[PDB]
Design a protein around this nucleic acid. Structure first.
Lengths: 149, 64, 114
RNA sequence: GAACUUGAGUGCAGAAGAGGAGAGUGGAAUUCCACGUGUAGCGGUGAAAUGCGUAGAGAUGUGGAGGAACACCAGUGGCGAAGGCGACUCUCUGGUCUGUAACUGACGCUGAGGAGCGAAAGCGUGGGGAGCGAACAGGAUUAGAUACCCUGGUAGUCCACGCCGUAAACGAUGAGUGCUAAGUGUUAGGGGGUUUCCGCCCCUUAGUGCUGCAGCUAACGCAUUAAGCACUCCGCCUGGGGAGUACGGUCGCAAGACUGAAACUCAAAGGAAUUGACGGGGGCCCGCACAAGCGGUGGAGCAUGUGGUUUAAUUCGAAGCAACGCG
């Protein structure tokens, strides 16, 4: 069988990042990169406006707050249902960070996902936020189950 | 290995020989088996009889 | 005081560490269940490490420094608890591997699946 | 009737052994007891709970009581007819093996019935009780759980004498004797070829393992420790069930043991091996099978097919995957 790997596209015409196009491919509903590109650039223009900063550094700070060190996997032996904590390899750190940004942004609820993604980045920058509940809770699940490693 | 008692020709082991018994006995106090000291069957029998008698007179230890 | 002996008894349920004084006077004690682990995690060496950490903190609170550590009981957390006595500010000099060996004695309770 | 020494046995000389019976003693550990340390758990489980615990436990140190088994040696090692026998020491005592040559000179083998031994459980009487532990109780599990698991715990396990007289009491292989290739460990001996030795080799016994020729066997396999080739003697079998039952008798305090059918019923029961399939057996591997994700279905509305039911007819066919937007 063996492990297979995938690829992704380097630039964005404004905000030249790999991972921002990785977020473009994420949150794509029904095969529409155009709508996700529109949502993303209008959101980052809100992040450049509402806070007078470049939104690249705010976006990496939000990622750094969300990227989880420790997943907690499963291990059922007998009738025990133990969860076992896993040191996450950093690709999955970035992609769990992007899932938590996208999911808790669209789960928030405001008058566009432009605004939801903007305010979720602004919350995950100054770490207290909705996806960071999931960050904290995964680290708490790894903290409770640390007896197994 | 080589047997001790066939080499030095010595017969009945004489419980008073506390230093020889202390050589055959292990570090904690146990009798070493025949595949460690290399003796015969017969000489291991007389050795273990000697060690048990010298243990009951405190010439040899039980537990350490 | 300065010297005592650390009695660790780590068995398949619990890893109990009592730091006592040389002619047997317990300064402080903490177990794997005292740390909070109630379940089977009591048997895990992480709980034995934590129990040794808390016993080491209490022993330094009373002030002893050079231990002489006696491992007792068949379990799993003996090595991590010896290592955690070292890393918590104490010295482990001698290691007494003393599990209670009956010679022949009483007969054990019956085997389990029968 | 006379002779013989090989078989048998006595004599002498060593050797080894948990061979037995009686008494005495030890060291771990377990439990319990008293006191110090000290604080909140311990115990246990797949998960927990019952139990134990602030009235101070578990841990830990010292002391004491008491019972039972004797780590390491320890070994397809030893002894015994078999059951069986593992601390040590003495008392009494049984057998074996080895070397013969001193003696006897066939004294030998086997043995129904009889007499004895005879694991464990059980029984009687008197002690004993530490651990374990039927029964019994509580907690779990479970649909139930008179179970496995957990926590407790009675008889019993232990000892003295008496009874039982049974085991998958097994080598599932009666005892004796002789003959019939090898290789190889090992236990207790003996002798030899150089060496005073250590030790190597050779040779021979008796016991104990494995692999193996001939031979045997249905096959598995046995094979000088026979399941070979023979002779002697004893015990036992004649399809499966009913049935080791019932009746009778003997023995037993009892539980039961031994002896032991018949009516009736079946055409099989059975051994060993082969091919498969299966396993809540082991190994290896693979697949959107699982995980990692993404989107759904199950909810609503409608489209469509199918079961029932309404029917005059609701035509027939498909029916787990592999029927049901199928013909």
């Amino acid at each position: 069988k063996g492990p297979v790997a995938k690829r992704d596209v380097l630039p964005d015409p404004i905000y030249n990042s790999k991972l921002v196009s990785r977020l473009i491919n994420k949150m794509m509903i029904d095969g529409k990169k155009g709508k996700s590109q529109t949502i993303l650039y209008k959101s980052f223009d809100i992040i450049k406006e509402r806070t007078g900063n470049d939104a690249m550094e705010v976006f990496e700070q939000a990622l750094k707050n969300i990227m989880p060190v420790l997943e907690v996997k499963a291990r059922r032996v007998g009738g025990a249902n133990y969860q076992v904590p896993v040191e996450v390899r950093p690709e999955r750190r970035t992609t769990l960070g992007l899932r938590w940004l996208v999911n808790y942004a669209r789960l928030r609820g405001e008058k566009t996902m432009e605004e939801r993604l903007a305010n979720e980045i602004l919350d995950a920058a100054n770490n207290t936020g909705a996806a960071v509940k999931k960050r904290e809770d995964t680290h708490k699940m790894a903290e409770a189950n640390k007896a197994f490693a | 290995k080589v047997c001790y008692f066939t080499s030095n020709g010595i017969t009945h082991i004489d419980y008073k020989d506390v230093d020889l018994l202390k050589k055959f006995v292990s570090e904690r106090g146990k009798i070493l088996p025949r595949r460690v000291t290399g003796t015969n069957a017969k000489y291991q029998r007389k050795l273990t009889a000697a060690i048990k008698r010298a243990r009951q007179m405190a010439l040899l230890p039980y537990v350490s | 005081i300065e010297s005592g002996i650390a009695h660790i008894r780590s068995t398949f349920n619990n890893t109990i560490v009592t730091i006592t004084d040389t002619h047997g006077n317990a300064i402080s004690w903490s177990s794997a269940g005292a740390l909070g682990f109630r379940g089977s995690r009591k048997s895990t060496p992480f709980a034995a490490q934590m129990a040794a950490e808390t016993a080491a903190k209490g022993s330094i609170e009373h002030g002893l420094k050079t231990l002489e550590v006696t491992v007792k009981g068949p379990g799993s957390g003996r090595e991590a608890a010896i290592r955690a006595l070292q890393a918590a500010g104490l010295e482990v000099t001698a290691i007494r591997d003393v599990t209670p060996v009956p010679h022949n004695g009483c007969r054990p309770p019956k085997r389990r699946r029968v």
